[PDB]
């Protein structure tokens, strides 16, 4: 595949994707173990004025990954931007 | 045991050779240093003159029988690349080395059902006999004894793995530039490392011969200079290029306009003196970007000097062009820890892992023979004895995110000593780390500085939807950021150019009525964007496209927005400010360079939106702000509303864990399903937010007040729907559920229209929403808005490298990839046309 067609392919499934988000259920649940299993990120940043996505990702760990983040052992370190702002710009108080 | 260290004697009648054994070798053989001298009788004061002819070849001779196992040989070209016998790494290779150097990885340990990972610092062990044989040849001529080894840096190159154990790793090496100092001879060589074929890190190797050398002759400087990226968006510059003699072109009415050129620059630099360079030759290929994101040669840089004082093509480029990675600092230094490390009564435990024989590490006699005040301590070991503590800290006890690694040696260390390493973070590469250590002994003198590029963790961003609306969100951040300045003015600008209304104005003071002027010229180009804008509903069940804005023609003059209390609580200004200051927020973290490179991302709703214009920027700032206000002006006129405003449709937060502890994700989509065909009114579980505990569902006002009263009914019953069904009777609850709701959904029609939707045990109603997004409501609005992504989503600006992987969708959920089967899943969950035109011609897009 050429890097030109493969662009328009990329192009195509992004219009449709965008168009059906109003258009097709939000399957949150199961994106959350994308991030949370198929990849194992240690940083869930929110992006937001308030932790709408933050307390959906810890109670998802809480839930059904207290048994998995003990038989790899990695810590998880689940933040927002409006909220711990201190801790991803790493300025900490003297 | 009492060996002997030195033999005495006269070798001839007027030669004294005095002798020095060393023990510790390969081959457990003892090697002679014979350092001749010249007794002369007839000068009296000083009769002991140093045979100074045929000196440096015999320390040679002494060093590589420690260093190099193969055969004795100073007749090779320094500029002409040095290759070393393929070296592997196993299981002991790591225990003895990390015990050695106290590197407590346990990824270095040996895990069940996981490779054994290396020391970044083993692969000076792995190339040691590649890099050292650079400074052999009899033109690169100096004393071992008092060769200080200045720097020693690691590059774990962008995408390949660090080293594991079995890999069989090669080690090559070619030497950068040699260059006569006043003080002596610094040689810089790079040593990299290739498993596979493939490299795998750049070992940066400063060697520095004090000393007088005359020979520069033999001095050469073949740097391969960073790549230098620079836009062409005048028709200023281009005439500065075109001037340029070195920038020569393969097509000379090339269009460099709007471009953007990479330089793939390597200068090779002879000398005449240590300032004055005798030949300059700056070459390499200039990369324009097209619009695939693809790098393609279209020139080649081809500069050619005699007598110059400096690079013009880099001089030029670096002021002209960036780097490709520009770091920034912190706006304060992190004073990580004050941490104490103690280098080891002994310098063998080192000495045999590497396979470095230094004697100045080992025999006191070598040791002060070089004016050393003892058995130097390998300055290697010290930088795996401090990289140890930086892999134990900034990296959380990982080996990954190790790139790259440079540590200077300043001072000279004896054994058994006191060290203070002072780790300082500084400022951000491109989301990496940059960590400045600075060791002390116990005297308070610097010993070690240098620093280490860390990679981050990997890293997931997630945009939040709509949710919270509130005045002045992001105006602290737009205040201070200059980012955050550029996103809003840009928005702005945009808004006021094409809609006739100012963002800013909106989240600062939440007018309740704004009127909409389109009063001139520049007037009726916003009044045409404006009955530009199409929507299509189902009356009568027709496909037929109505228009937004019902009351603008082209005899309108003026539109007013109204509100009850301000603008900010309708969803058509509420969503452009919160995709605002999120895209702003992650602009602000891209300014301070905190965004990993291969980092996922997972939009939510709209934040899907914000996800793919900040990780991917396929749509300009100016293109997301318009598409978020037409989905939320399609997502307003998309249900019918009385005259007040008020539509029948509306939210719940479900909370399953509330109604039943055995309740499951399977009956809460079974009692939606079972209530949609029995009441016959649109619900349906439009967010999969959290299992169990917090869904959304969108529908009829009517239809979300009979699965609440099922869910009161069900927990004062206590009787569960996936037990009774198999351990019961078969598709006997699917006719005692219909009665449930049957009950639930006739007193759910009494009511008026605009019916108070009640929160219950397990529902919670959303309020400020009466439209069914994310349901099959608007199956029939969906098609104007492919018309409407088309102009604004340009196909030259989405990049597949910057999206596989990594944007996740909220559709499929599954990291995005350009296959027939991701397409089929997409056609699958939503039936479109274009997927399948696709599908069926997959193989004619193959070839």
Partial sequence: ?94 | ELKPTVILKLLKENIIQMEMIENRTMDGKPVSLPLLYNFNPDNGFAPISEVMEDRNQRIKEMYWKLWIDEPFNLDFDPRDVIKGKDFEITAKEVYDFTHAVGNNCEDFVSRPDRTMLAPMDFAIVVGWRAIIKAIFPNTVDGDLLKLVHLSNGYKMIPGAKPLQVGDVVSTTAVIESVVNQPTGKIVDVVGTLSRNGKPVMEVTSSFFYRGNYTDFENTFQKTVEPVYQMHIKTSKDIAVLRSKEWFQLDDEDFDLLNKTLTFETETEVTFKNANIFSSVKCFGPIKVELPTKETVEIGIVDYEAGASHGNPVVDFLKRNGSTLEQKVNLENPIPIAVLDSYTPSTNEPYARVSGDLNPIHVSRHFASYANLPGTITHGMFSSASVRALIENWAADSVSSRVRGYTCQFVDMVLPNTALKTSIQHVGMINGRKLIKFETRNEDDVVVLTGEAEIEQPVTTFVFTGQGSQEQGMGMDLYKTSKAAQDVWNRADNHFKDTYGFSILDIVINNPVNLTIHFGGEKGKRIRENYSAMIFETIVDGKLKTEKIFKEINEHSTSYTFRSEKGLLSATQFTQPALTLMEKAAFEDLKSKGLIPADATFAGHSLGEYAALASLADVMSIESLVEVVFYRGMTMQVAVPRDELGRSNYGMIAINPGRVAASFSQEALQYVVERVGKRTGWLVEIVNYNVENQQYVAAGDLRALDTVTNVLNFIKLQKIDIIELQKSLSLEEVEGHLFEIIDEASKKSAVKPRPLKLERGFACIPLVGISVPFHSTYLMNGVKPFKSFLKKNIIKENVKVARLAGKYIPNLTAKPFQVTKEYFQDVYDLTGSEPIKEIIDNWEKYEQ
Avoid at chain 1, 36 to 49: A, H, S, Y
């Fill in chain 1, 1 to 94: 595949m050429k890097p030109e067609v493969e662009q328009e392919l990329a192009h195509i499934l992004l219009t449709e994707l965008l168009a059906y988000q109003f258009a097709s259920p939000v399957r949150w649940i199961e994106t959350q173990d994308v991030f949370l299993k198929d990849f194992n990120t240690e940083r869930v940043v929110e992006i937001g004025p308030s932790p709408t996505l933050a307390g959906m990702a810890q109670r998802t760990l809480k839930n059904k990954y207290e048994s998995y983040d003990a038989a790899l052992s990695l810590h998880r370190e689940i933040l927002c931007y409006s909220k711990d702002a201190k801790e991803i710009y790493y300025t900490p108080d003297p």
